[PDB]
Amino acid sequence: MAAAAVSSAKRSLRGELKQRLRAMSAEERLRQSRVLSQKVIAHSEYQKSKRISIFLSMQDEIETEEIIKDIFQRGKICFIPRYRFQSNHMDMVRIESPEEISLLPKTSWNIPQPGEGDVREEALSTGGLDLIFMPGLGFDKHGNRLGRGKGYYDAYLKRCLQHQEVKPYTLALAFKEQICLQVPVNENDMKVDEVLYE
Ligand SMILES: [Mg+2]
Ligand SMILES: [Mg+2]
Ligand SMILES: [Mg+2]
Ligand SMILES: [Mg+2]
Ligand SMILES: [Mg+2]
Ligand SMILES: [Mg+2]
Ligand SMILES: [Mg+2]
Ligand SMILES: [Mg+2]
Ligand SMILES: [Mg+2]
Ligand SMILES: [Mg+2]
Ligand SMILES: [Mg+2]
Ligand SMILES: [Mg+2]
Ligand code: NI
Ligand code: NI
Ligand code: NI
């Protein structure tokens, strides 16, 4: 019953967060995205990181395009999510340029990811990750994260705590609108090291 009461709060907050996000102008999204991009490029953990995981942005997410360009300009090794829609399973798969993203097939969420027969280098098979940019519907200032309900990123973060002597740095990119007072969590949810916004 306590488990269910947590899920209910998470579900209620998602709907509340999604309404706010849907109500944002396209040009305001692009604006905070530009503010976060510049903040990320200045960020010391980003500048030091050599192997990176970043997400490809949905319409209700901070746009990562300018970050991805910077990543490749600085010769960083770039990995992106490849979701296995059957379960809460994802890997991080290597892409070799920003332009490759444009030719990839898309999922039912209209997000690019290498297809089923496209054999990719997975981050955890070649040394893990220094830095993971974390998407999500909401974050609080304690680093608690509210995902979309599937727990892909919670599960993946636990996997990185195998393989890696030193865990990845986890950097969430959030609209000011996604910043919450209290994000409902259970013992299974994974905090992020830092939430960027403004
Ligand atoms: Mg690092
Ligand atoms: Mg956007
Ligand atoms: Mg699938
Ligand atoms: Mg992997
Ligand atoms: Mg390739
Ligand atoms: Mg496509
Ligand atoms: Mg996984
Ligand atoms: Mg709140
Ligand atoms: Mg979570
Ligand atoms: Mg937590
Ligand atoms: Mg923090
Ligand atoms: Mg701030
Ligand atoms: Ni897999
Ligand atoms: Ni190659
Ligand atoms: Ni608090």
UniProtKB/Swiss-Prot annotation:
Q: Which InterPro entries match?
A: FTHF_cligase, FTHF_cligase-like_sf, NagB/RpiA_transferase-like
Q: Where does this chain mainly localize?
A: cytoplasm
Query: Record's Pfam families?
Result: 5-FTHF_cyc-lig
Q: Which UniProt keywords apply?
A: Acetylation, ATP-binding, Cytoplasm, Disease variant, Epilepsy, Folate-binding, Ligase, Magnesium, Metal-binding, Nucleotide-binding
| Cofactor dependency | Mg(2+)
User: What GO CC terms are in its UniProt record?
Assistant: cytoplasm; cytosol; mitochondrial matrix; mitochondrion
Q: Which residues bind Mg(2+)?
A: D154, D189
The record lists substrate as bound by L56, E61, R148, G149, K150, G151, Y152
Q: Which residues carry this modification: N-acetylalanine?
A: A2
Q: Name one GO biological process term.
A: folic acid catabolic process
Q: One GO molecular function term?
A: ATP binding
The record lists ATP as bound by K10, R11, S12, L13, R14, R145, L146, G147, R148, G149, K150, G151, Y152, Y153
User: Where does the signal peptide begin and end?
Assistant: none
Reaction equations catalysed = (6S)-5-formyl-5,6,7,8-tetrahydrofolate + ATP = (6R)-5,10-methenyltetrahydrofolate + ADP + phosphate
Under Enzyme Commission nomenclature, its number is 6.3.3.2
Q: Which Gene3D superfamilies match?
A: NagB/RpiA/CoA transferase-like
Q: Tell me where it resides.
A: Cytoplasm
Disease link:
Neurodevelopmental disorder with microcephaly, epilepsy, and hypomyelination: An autosomal recessive neurodevelopmental disorder with onset at birth or in early infancy, and characterized by microcephaly, short stature, severe global developmental delay, progressive spasticity, and epilepsy. Brain imaging shows delayed myelination, hypomyelination, enlarged ventricles, and cerebellar atrophy.
**How does this protein assemble?**
Monomer.
Protein family: Belongs to the 5-formyltetrahydrofolate cyclo-ligase family.
Protein role? Contributes to tetrahydrofolate metabolism. Helps regulate carbon flow through the folate-dependent one-carbon metabolic network that supplies carbon for the biosynthesis of purines, thymidine and amino acids. Catalyzes the irreversible conversion of 5-formyltetrahydrofolate (5-FTHF) to yield 5,10-methenyltetrahydrofolate.
The name of this protein is 5-formyltetrahydrofolate cyclo-ligase
- State which gene encodes it: MTHFS
